[PDB]
Assembly symmetry: D2
Homo-oligomer: 391 residues x 4
């Protein structure tokens, strides 16, 4: 039949994949090759099938097709990293003199590319509060090629109204690019809401197993062809290795059941934190006091596996808390099967001036939690123990 016709869990398992025609092997083979051979001079010219992995590969093709199906896009393009997904996309679309309107609340490394790299190539970027679609509209210029957003966004899990922003971008002649890393296609589908291009770090939930760095771009065939044959081939060279593609295919098999459990666990933990008198604030789209709660309910099928919260006692309390957990692991990644915790003020933004962190929504007591697949009772006990100690 056509994989586009099955239910979402069925698609997660099957889309883009089939038994190997030649051998019947059920697992997608790992085509760990650089070289592809032609049967003749004619068959070589015809393709100029496969030719060379940095242009294409059967293992990676399966991943690209699967993710395109899951995001309801025409085509996918795998990359060496989430960063490469973003930069391959933007460097394909933009040239000197062009302009981008970007959310301010975005991944830190994206922010560096946008604030420092792009302008050195003559591409200017305006940063705005994308929670306020009017700020996006006001920042648009005749030269604006792209509006770029992330939702939910760190560090307080604020949201962006994708459909509304898409309409604004399109009326003003720009494309909307959405980083859907935090949600995965299981929880949010930006293309269905009017986005033109979706990017992911598959490093997070899509792979889910904390053992692959990689990215994916999904969009129209016409664009993806340019991202592949110009962006990857002629700019970033950010190809994904076939082994990484195979691991990601393997990881994504369980995307549905993983996201369900991540989100079930996260909701329980969020409610625990909201009831804890030593915790001043809890940021989680699943809590009704979230400023954009109703938007979240329309736009997201589940509230996600990530929680941020503020512990009483500022910087020292935050440090003491992360130093006091015994089960949660101290790390800066997210979307793994293990629960990960970090305290940005002391771990990643320690050198940054306290007042500058504050402006960026990073308070001294802010803790970010990536909820894993453990028993939530064990995670809650670990948190309760650490919070008691830290306060």
């Amino acid at each position: 039949s056509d994989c586009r016709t099955y239910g979402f869990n069925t698609q997660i398992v099957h889309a883009g994949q089939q038994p190997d025609p030649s051998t019947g092997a059920l697992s997608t083979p790992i085509f760990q090759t650089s070289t592809f051979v032609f049967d003749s001079a004619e068959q070589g010219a015809a393709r100029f099938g496969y030719i060379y992995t940095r242009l294409g590969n059967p293992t990676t093709d399966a991943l690209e097709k699967k993710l395109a199906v899951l995001e309801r896009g025409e085509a996918g393009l795998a990359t060496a990293s989430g960063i490469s997904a973003i930069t391959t996309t933007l460097l394909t679309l933009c040239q000197q003199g062009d302009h981008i309107v970007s959310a301010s609340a975005i991944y830190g490394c994206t922010h560096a590319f946008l604030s420092h790299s792009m302008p050195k190539f003559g591409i200017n970027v305006r940063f705005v509060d994308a929670a306020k679609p009017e700020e996006i509209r006001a920042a648009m210029r005749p030269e604006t090629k792209v509006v770029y957003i992330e939702t939910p966004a760190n560090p307080t899990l604020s949201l962006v109204d994708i459909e509304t922003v898409a309409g604004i971008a399109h009326q003003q002649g720009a494309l909307l690019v959405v980083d859907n890393t935090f949600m995965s296609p299981y929880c949010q589908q930006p293309l269905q809401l009017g986005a033109d291009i979706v990017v992911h770090s598959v490093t997070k939930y899509i792979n889910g197993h904390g053992d692959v760095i990689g990215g994916i771009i999904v969009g129209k065939q016409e664009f993806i062809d340019q991202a592949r044959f110009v962006g990857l081939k002629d700019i970033t060279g950010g190809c994904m290795s076939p082994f990484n593609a195979w691991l990601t295919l393997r990881g994504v098999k369980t995307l549905g059941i993983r996201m369900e459990r991540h989100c079930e666990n996260a909701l329980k933990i969020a409610r625990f934190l909201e009831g804890h008198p030593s915790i001043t604030r809890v940021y989680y789209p699943g809590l009704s006091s979230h400023p954009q709660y109703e938007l979240g309910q329309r736009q997201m099928s589940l509230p996600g596996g990530i929680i941020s919260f503020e512990i009483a006692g500022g910087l020292e309390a935050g440090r003491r808390m992360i130093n006091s957990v015994e089960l949660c692991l101290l790390a800066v990644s997210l979307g793994d099967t293990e629960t990960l915790i970090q305290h940005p003020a002391s771990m990643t933004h320690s050198p940054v001036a306290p007042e500058e962190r504050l402006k960026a929504g990073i308070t001294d007591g802010l803790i970010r939690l990536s909820v894993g697949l453990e028993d939530p009772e064990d995670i809650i006990n670990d948190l309760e123990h650490a919070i008691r100690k830290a306060t």
Copy 2:
């Protein structure tokens, strides 16, 4: 001791590698992880050791250190592809308004990046015949940041005098970047001749096994740090996967013995071709009639594993010949353990106007051969059979 002190074969085997301290495992472990954990808040801030694979990884570090030792450079940086090695380097070094002087005889995909991508970012490129160092000098401008060369260069294996070009570049305040892919560090060491930065596609000889796409950059620590923390992190995102790094480490173990055999085989095959009346020309640095033979003898320890030659009878003869080989495989890669053959006029440049191919040194009868590790007698027999048939 210090690996920098052992003989070159010893370095090939050992440099950058040692038994795992914790377990004694001799093979470098495959650190197929995205996430690294900290023991405390303090240990997390201290590093901001390892943190996240796209910034660094112990497996990839071993490869980088080994290649730095082999090229006699301070530091190495692994990438997702040869292309990414080149673009990460150049996009790190250059910004809008800057200028590059490049050889015309370079890898095709490099040429696209330089001719189309760079100018769209405001970076201008002059192409010159780098076999004539005076053309390099004449093309330099106050804005020139980089001179970029490849040697030997396709498709006729012409050479570039690295030491002479380095002196010219430096006197005029530019860096010299050399693509050393064709030679490998076993056969040529551009840094020892004054180059500032060496790049490779490890996809070719360094890996040697036709199953990895990847690149490497070697140079001063100061530059490599920028290529890593800005180029990779903030521009291309072109990180190498740890599995690919491990395979490359494994492949490079045999670099010395592979290059010796490739070159022994190639010399035999080149001499056979030079004696064949149906072959009009043979391009191989190991043949004394090579226009830059003596330069090759000073600059290269071995003449390489690649040969180009022209078969009598033009386009149709070239097509018939590649369609008539039975052992050599039709492919566009090089540096594999298998002998690979291609006929650019019919396979890769078929759409290109015949007169434009001619200007680029690609004649209708030109065949390129990547000589593998087979018995040279079998390769010669295959070639002899195919040539007889084609003519």
Copy 3:
């Protein structure tokens, strides 16, 4: 702390694993090595730590420890295959003159080893209906070393009362070995019910991703040491490769959520089949008409992901049905993320005399289904379509 103290899902994620001490890498490194190096002559003799992978390996050790925790056993031993787990166990325990009492309803390849291989080594085997514990007792001899059972058992998913059989075996001085492949430790824990040794094919649910052949043995340290240093080292040589161990560790991360979904899906499908007038019988421990339903409820936490059923119309109907499915895949494995279906009478037991199949509970219309992670509605629709066509 101690991983033995956390909840079962937490153990699934964490047991046997921790961040790499030296690097902080969260993923268990792949120690793909054969060789381990010593720091001195003394450190070499001391171990005679690690020495050589076929004796031990840090990656494989993590898997062994995890599975020991999950089965509530002292120690684990990984093997090249489920078969090797069984034969390494039995060949370690038994010698010429010894006797084994085995269930008749066991894995086919086990049956070959027991019926043909063992007797040629002077080890005699009695086969009994293990659904009747009295038959086990009656078959025991002074020479009986082992009682061997599988539960649930193919092809009608009959059960064996582990606790009762354990008591009988022990009173008569024998060990009880249980193949727990069908259930996984998530659904059944034979050691907790008195079994001495548990074996698995990890090829099925423990890995769960259809890309690893492997086995595991769990039991007392004293026995496992013998299985390792004599059974593996001196009899079967059936070591697991570190890469396979790593993939299995990765697969087992999702064991809990996978089993929950497999069993939720299977129950739905079983109830659908039980309501279908073209289906004469449905064998599933989750259906109350199962002959040993109550035993199943005490012994198993979930009824499993495997269903067998009989379609009206015998051999031709069974053939037509499996030839008519479009989503379910025709294969003989089980426990994969994809739904797999087979018709033993036409696929695996076709050469076997119809009357002999009947005696073994394999009727002409019997179909076996391994329910995957797809939407159960899609699987049901596929089954409904195929059944309608087949009848």
Copy 4:
């Protein structure tokens, strides 16, 4: 054509391998699957192509075919380990009441299987000095099924005359099994000299990269079919993982050039040692004073990469020497790209009574060296330094 017709180096590269028909991928794909799917009920029964990896796999098939070609045998069978190659072979061939005549000078773990395991299965073994073919003849009985030999043999690299022993075994109705691990097919071809079955630990030279544990069996199709469908399937379960097969295929690509360099290096080192006044004896088939030198010249194309030697000063000198090397690595494996050294009296046989070691040819001063691919000058310097210190 037919790979059996090309030169040996060509066969090393190409035999058993070809570009993937479906995709053109040059590297043999890694078919990391457990499950194979059928297109129909009929196609399923027909095979009962591939079915299940423990029975067969396309990646492993390529390795088996290649090694069969290299040993000039009909068929190959890959296994989980060298030990499993040996035991799968012998347990397939022998049953209770049968007898084996074995060399005494064999791999230690083989000796355990033969001396302890076999007799417990009713299979008796006589050990003889296989350097004396008359001892083999004298030990043969009506029940003798197999004569088993290893050549060269540890720990003094004594030889066995394969052709002569084959003739004796055959006249008395037995098969000859030869462990060809030390030589590899590049240096010795026992089947060409009359052996019936060859086994290897591919862990050593065939893989050559110190990162795979595995074995191979090569022999007649009729026997290999039994070793596969009974030995592996019904006795040891010792299947090789497809990833290990792929790594071994990759490693064996360089077998020819590796063996040439190992042996060139070893001869140089052996001659150095023979000239050293602190070294009482040097055991190396390449030295003319080897007791069976001429036999070695007829039977072996190269003298190998392994050397044993005795250092003056017995146990303490041996310990001091291995504790004094700085480049050579202390390990018990062999055939790796790194030079490995061990002192059996202090490292592996330390608990063994000194007088018992002596009987087995293991003197207190005996050192075993596996010569790697380093510059031999560096290895010699390291040895010279250590010997001076130790004495």
